Predict the structure.
Amino acid sequence: AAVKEFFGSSQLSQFMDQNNPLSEITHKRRISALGPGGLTRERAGFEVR
Amino acid sequence: ARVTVQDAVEKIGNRFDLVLVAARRARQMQVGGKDPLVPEENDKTTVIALREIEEGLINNQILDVRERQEQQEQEA
Amino acid sequence: TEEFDAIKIALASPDMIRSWSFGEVKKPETINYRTFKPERDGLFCARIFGPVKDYECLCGKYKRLKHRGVICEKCGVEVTQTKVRRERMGHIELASPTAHIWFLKSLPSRIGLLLDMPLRDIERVLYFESYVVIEGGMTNLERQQILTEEQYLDALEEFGDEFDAKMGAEAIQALLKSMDLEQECEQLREELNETNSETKRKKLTKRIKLLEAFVQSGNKPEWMILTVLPVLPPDLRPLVPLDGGRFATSDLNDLYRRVINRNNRLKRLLDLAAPDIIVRNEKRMLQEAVDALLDNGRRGRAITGSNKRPLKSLADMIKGKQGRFRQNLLGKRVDYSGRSVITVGPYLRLHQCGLPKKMALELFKPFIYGKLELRGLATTIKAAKKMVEREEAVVWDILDEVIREHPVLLNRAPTLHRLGIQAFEPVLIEGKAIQLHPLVCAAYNADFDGDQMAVHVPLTLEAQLEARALMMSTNNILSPANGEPIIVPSQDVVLGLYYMTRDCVNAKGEGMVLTGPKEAERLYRSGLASLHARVKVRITEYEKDANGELVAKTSLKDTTVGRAILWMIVPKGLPYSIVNQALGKKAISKMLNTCYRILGLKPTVIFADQIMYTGFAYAARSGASVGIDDMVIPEKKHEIISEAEAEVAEIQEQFQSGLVTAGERYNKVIDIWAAANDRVSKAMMDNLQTETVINRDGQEEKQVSFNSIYMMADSGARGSAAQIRQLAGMRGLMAKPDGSIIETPITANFREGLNVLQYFISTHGARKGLADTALKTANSGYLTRRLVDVAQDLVVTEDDCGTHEGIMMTPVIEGGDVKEPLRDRVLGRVTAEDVLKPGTADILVPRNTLLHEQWCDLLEENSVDAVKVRSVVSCDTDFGVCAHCYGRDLARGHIINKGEAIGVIAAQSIGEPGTQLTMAAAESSIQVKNKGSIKLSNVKSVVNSSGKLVITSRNTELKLIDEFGRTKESYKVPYGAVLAKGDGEQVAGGETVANWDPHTMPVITEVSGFVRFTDMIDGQTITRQTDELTGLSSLVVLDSAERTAGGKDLRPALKIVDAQGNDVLIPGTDMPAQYFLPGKAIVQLEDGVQISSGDTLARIPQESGGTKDITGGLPRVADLFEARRPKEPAILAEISGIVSFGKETKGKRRLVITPVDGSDPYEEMIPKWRQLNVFEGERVERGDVISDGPEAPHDILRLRGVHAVTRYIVNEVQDVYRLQGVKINDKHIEVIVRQMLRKATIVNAGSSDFLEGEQVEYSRVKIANRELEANGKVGATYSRDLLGITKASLATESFISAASFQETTRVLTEAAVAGKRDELRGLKENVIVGRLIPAGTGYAYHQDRMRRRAAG
Amino acid sequence: HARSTGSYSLVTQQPLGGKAQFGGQRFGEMEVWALEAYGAAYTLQEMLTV
Amino acid sequence: ITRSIADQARTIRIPVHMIETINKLNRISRQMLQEMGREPTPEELAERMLMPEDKIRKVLKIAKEPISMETPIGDDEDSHLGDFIEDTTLELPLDSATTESLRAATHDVLAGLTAREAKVLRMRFGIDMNTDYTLEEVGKQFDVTRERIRQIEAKALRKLRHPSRSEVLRSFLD
DNA sequence: CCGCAGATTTTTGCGAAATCTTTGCAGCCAGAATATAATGTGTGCATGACGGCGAATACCC
DNA sequence: GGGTATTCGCCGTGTACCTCTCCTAGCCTATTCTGGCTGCAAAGATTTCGCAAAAATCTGCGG
RNA sequence: AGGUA
């Protein structure tokens, strides 16, 4: 149940933006500073941006 | 179609009670009971009210006096 | 259908809570799971809150409309309408009284302050940490005191059945019961008349004010402790079925379930006589649950099972951002609206916009039904629905009919100013996107790159008319923040106009003679001539002259063919000179402004549409294209780059030699690269500007280039000189992280592709720009929200009030030159004084009257230096402002109309440009740039034996009187200077009229004699650095930030005495002969040195500036409007008279001002880190500064007066705005200020408490009443106080407005405990209520209601 | 998306909802300010109540 | 503790015996899941219990607790679930206008009939008053309590059968 | 333009069934009753904006 | 006296779309007897619906 | 959640 919660409903588990091969490549290569253990959007916080 | 209301503002300088008086005129125009005084081009009551005020037929005073006289023939 | 003049908020009583309740919620049950019929008697209950489905008992007994006046008595369930379930409230009978969290953890704790008892003590008592005595007896135990477990046990053992003490909310409620308000009020009133001690009187006054306010509220303090808890109607906490095992349930439902569970458990435990620990635990349960329900978040959060998220509470549903959710935002959704992407509408007229057929059909479905049934094509609404969903051709004519006259509102996704919503006549178009008029996109700030706009349909006839009169685009051709038109040709049309008017040096058909521009158009269209060529054309220009009559003058003008073609478009009545020129954006904007001012509205709209069409057509015929060759690289780019590389290499080599410091080397390199960038840009602009060298008849000539990019650069269509500089030249210096300018700039441009590393460098600038745009947009939104809040209730209520007060109005000169003239700042204002001509005493401006362009021209002809203008701040009107004191600005040159809401338009005007805000020869020698009369203001100078006009004090100004009366150059003379010019001497331009050392301020003696050291200890105040060469020394007076243990007990000074020893005073100066040396005043002249008038006494070191100390943009504007301190307030001389020093350094040095007459003692504090500009024994006046540094608005208002603080705020904010090129009429800032100072502090009361922060309008009507009456009580005197916009909006008269857009919980608590009764008469109040606003169209209605109130 | 009648809400009556026909357009506080700036009273009342 | 979990932990009430049945179902589901190693198949669940299987699935539906609307739809979108829930207890304005037009048409048609026939019809079905009356109740007021009142009603119906008063009402019912 | 036929109106009659209350039944359900070995412990602490600001005790001079 | 000198909470944070449905967990957990409640089955009591059918009534036109 | 202004 917890593994399914991670893979399905999480800040870093997203529907693949699938309208281009480039879109898929970018989504799989994406790097997020957000998520569990990262940075909340309460930032700027200009340093990281 | 009435592109500008500046000529109407000239007759009624407040530009806000102008809306009230022309709205009263147009409502008496749409709701049955009153007949037009200016020719139309298959237009609704709004530009009719604008044209009537623009030529000086209708302002606050004319609407008020007319509602009196009509009140007197209906009471008879 | 509901009429009510006001809303009262007060403390809910348990009896009236039961009055609201229709039944007691006794069970936490909700429903029967499989059967979704609500349980009895649970949170959802038909027996309590009413039936679920329409007009039938939930037992299967009665199902009909007949059984509606009688409830079902055969079972618990009643039968009514189902909407009743949305309004019926319930109540829960709490076994133990429970404290209200809002009255507890608000920063002012109403329970705490009413009991005058600190917060920790209430927290410990309520949460069962300690006992508290609910009245004692004949004990040594006070009526109120907290006791711990062992202390309470010891008291109980020591004192028997006389000791009443409990624990928790029951104890708090018992305390509130035992406290009587009226009796304590009487006791305090008696004591005040008897007590004379200051502290005792202050305590009595505070307590009596608090208790009297509570009594006037008509509330009983026991009501703060909740005995019965109301429960919200179930429909407002809905439970709706959803597919699968998931069902939508309210967090309120779970919270009330928890509360009911804990209450029932407490009841059971009490019935079972449970041990004290358990019952205390369960009371803790109930208190925690009630606190979470009322406001979850101030108790260490509450989470539910199967869901990890803070539960929604009633406070959380009320408190929202931005503003109240359901009422205004987010978001007050609306019907009869659509949304779509926008496209250009280049064929449309200004008063109309393209609306797609499908959106028009869907929007107007009721109208289509009405007209179909009117002409009888459908016998029922259902048949009309079938017809419209079939979309037959029949309904389309009906649709055209209903659209023909109906105007629709177009709205941009963000709305920054009132132009964000504009009416247009919809025109049916096949397609799917809204076509928008190209001229209007500038107002919307909408670019066709996927922007979506919304369309609203004004339904009622009044709304249709209201949109046509006010919402219409043609009625809003002028910006509300400035008279110059907002519908200005922008980019493509400007380019077309420029190409049409710009002249060549040789083309087909030069030297021809033409009559009328019609021959010009014929020649151009036939290809017999060129669009631009010098031609003599006979044209009839019409001039508005005499009394408003057209004067036809027909003569020959030397112009171009394109210019004549344009003149064909120009309506009759304008001078031809306006078009006989190259036309940029500025030229076209000015031409439209002149057309509007001279002709009127309809000619302006027609001319704007025609110029749009002409510009588009001739831009298309232009074929203006940007290629790869139209960024011609300047030939000297490589040479300049190589040179600059050579000098920076030389500088780096010299840095290794240690000859130049790292900072100086960096500065030199930066300057070298800046010079190289400027040279490259200048060479590029020279190349592009006059690129055409073609011969006129064989003789080559240099004239304006046909280069396209130079056309878009020059016409101002898109891209400035800086923009083209990055394209054709070199993009130059930028910055790296930490915001420092990079040592090596980018030597490449976008035509010579940037290499990897330079692009990576530019990426930092790009990221910074984007993040700045985002953050500045958010900050601008917050700022404009605050401005709307403070300026919400302000509206023009009177045509005139009658007042000769105002502001002294002058063209502003900051630095050395004028940047904003008199005319622009006074245009559209009303006169407050009949100002005379600068020469003869002749009145050219009559009694207070509106100043239009003619009066401004008259004022320019007879240049008067200053004009008194009735500002809104000085208006005597209450509950609004008079029409004159505002001005004229709106969308017309006429005076403001009564009922117009100036507050909101001003707030929008100041807020909208917020997204545009992303932010030697000085102080050494004054150099007047022009030749004019020299005048000194507030000067203290006397000519000495050396002819030196030495100016003392830092409050002296040097103006420059022009030929008539106008100052055009103003400067500030610091303390100590040398001037070779007099008070009437003429000075040439660029001539050094004053001079002083840039390294130090010299104190030049104006008398003679020996220097005597007064208050000197060699080693405490001054330090020995004697370097006697001719009798000199480097004795250092320690800086006025820190001194020694003996330097803090004396004020070091230099007295000037003669040989006899008698005092020799300086003539013609307030300065005494005893120079009080400030910090770092290095005593060059030792004791016993003959000083000449013209010799330095003590130098004050400086740095000749070189450091930035000015900020602007959104934070600066916000701080100005919040009246923030500048972290170093420049204290002023707060009373006129002689000044003197006091006892030195009790930590902060005291300064005593004693006026020459009247109440003498005015000792005050001055901190010892300040740099004093005050000298003891001089005659100062109220307003003079005492210490250097920036000022704060508070003391400016308090001392210099209201007009002075208004002038300061206006000038400071306009300085920020003019820095970015945005112009705002100062009346907007004036009305914002007028809203900021709506509160005043009473000194002498009429019916107040001598310190009461009270609304000025009530104070003003009261003082008017007492003055007109024979009763001059008391009194009454007031002093206007300045509050920040957030504070002013927070402390308004209506609690609805304050609670809406600011701290909702605290405002609601304050209003409830005070029992406030807001009486509406405010835009946002009536918005929340849902009636006509008391502004504009609605002002007539409310004024009628005002007549219906207080009178039959 | 365009509507004249359709999805309302439970707790409030603000029209919104539906992936077939959506709600109306949010007439937020910005637009209310825009109307208040003019003498727009009846149109504002339509935006708010009717 | 079991009583507390059964009562105060479920948002909707679930009986204690039903809660025990749910717990048994979950335990047997876990047993079958770890034995078969794939999933709990409803057939084996039916086999283990005396419970048919439709009751099993309805119980499984019941065992799940309601969710808040304050949860974001779409994994932390700034919109909440309750912001999308349509009010199904509100009559559509289309239907309200249809009802008003139908009431007007029925009133006009009743006015098109005779006095006593229309009068009988008004109280027989409760037309244009907030009360409804039975056939015998109308007959008592018409001082005729016999087959005559129902014959008058049938005569009114037969008169309405004509395609001159039914055409206007024909549109409402398709 | 008037009297009977077609169409319309008048009048008496029987079957049908549904509904309201009462009685028997089955699934739902609540409390009352019985005596397995288990008490200082768990526990969630989830954590990187930014500016303003008064209230609440501390501490030097 | 007294003036900072810390720490201790509270508050504010752009607009408006769209796609997504993703929202949901342990299972460690004892037996039962008595009585009522509620949905449903069954029966007496009663009103309300249609044809039946003949008798009275309404309406068209030519001799 | 992602994307748009």
